Design a protein around this ligand. Structure first.
Ligand SMILES: *[C@@H]1O[C@H](CO)[C@@H](O[C@@H]2O[C@H](CO)[C@@H](O)[C@H](O)[C@H]2NC(C)=O)[C@H](O)[C@H]1NC(C)=O
Ligand SMILES: Nc1ncnc2[nH]cnc12
Length: 246
């Protein structure tokens, strides 16, 4: 398990949580010196439990699938919640079995459904440590519309940050003031799968991408990532989605 307390949290204790979250995800191989996540994991070992604690010390346990960093559900008090999709339904067989009741949310977990349910594209939803403390708080009591927005916050803070050092740094900058994500944050979120595959394909292709990945940069404009010498590859991405899952 890993853990994070919003109470007293600063850029460094968050950095330390995001480190632990990365280091909880098993791998047997590194590709260009980036942990390569497993094809699959059987049984309960598939699921990492994150204990998040709001500013007041109230808590939720989030279940994360260690092959893709995908959040499947969480436990609030004696109620478990899960996204409405086959992979979360599977997870429900392994985690939080002692919850008094299980609610299945009325959406799946992908950004497009969550945004629909939230009424907002995540370009318009502030994130940061304060947004994360709100989200923990929201998810403590079932409200499906408000949960969708909180889950957007939760996914980007925790999973998207473990995936990209850049997104981790963005959150750190938003330690005490939330702010909507940069376009490059959005770009990086939406290319994880694409990058993970091109980095794996570069391995028999002299570091060169079979297909270039188009991002948006820090500056605020469009760029093509064509090989493993890119900053995106050499310092930004921290985890690879195995091509066996793409
Ligand atoms: C790999 O990526 C680098 C960019 O990081 C490419 O080189 C650049 O592209 C052209 C020259 O061919 C110039 O516009 C840039 O200034 C170059 N930058 C640097 C730092 O060299 C390179 O062409 C790519 N290689 C492959 C095989 O795709
Ligand atoms: N549920 C989820 N968990 C992690 N990353 C995601 N990206 C979109 N949805 C996600």
């Amino acid at each position: 398990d890993v853990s994070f307390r919003l109470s007293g949290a600063d850029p460094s204790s968050y950095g330390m949580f995001i480190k632990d979250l990365r280091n909880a995800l098993p791998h047997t191989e590194k590709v260009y010196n980036i942990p390569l996540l497993l094809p699959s994991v059987s049984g309960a070992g598939r699921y990492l439990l994150m204990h998040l604690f709001n500013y007041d010390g109230n808590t939720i346990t989030v279940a994360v699938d260690v092959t893709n960093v995908y959040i499947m559900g969480y436990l609030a008090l004696t109620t478990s919640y899960f996204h409405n999709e086959p992979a979360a339904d599977l997870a429900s067989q392994y985690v939080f079995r002692s919850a008094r009741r299980k609610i299945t949310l009325p959406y799946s977990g992908n950004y497009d459904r969550l945004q629909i349910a939230a009424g907002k594209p995540r370009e318009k939803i502030p994130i940061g440590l304060p947004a994360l403390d709100t989200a923990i708080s929201t998810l403590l009591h079932y409200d499906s519309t408000a949960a969708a927005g909180a889950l957007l916050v939760l996914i980007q803070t925790t999973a998207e940050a473990a995936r990209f050092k850049y997104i981790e740094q963005q959150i750190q900058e938003r330690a005490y003031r939330d702010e909507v994500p940069s376009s490059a944050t959005i770009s990086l979120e939406n290319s994880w799968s694409g990058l993970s595959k091109q980095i794996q394909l570069a391995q028999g292709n002299n570091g060169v991408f079979r297909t270039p990945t188009v991002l948006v940069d820090s500056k605020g404009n469009r760029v093509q990532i064509t090989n493993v010498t890119s900053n995106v590859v050499t310092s930004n991405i921290q985890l690879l989605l195995n091509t066996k899952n793409i």
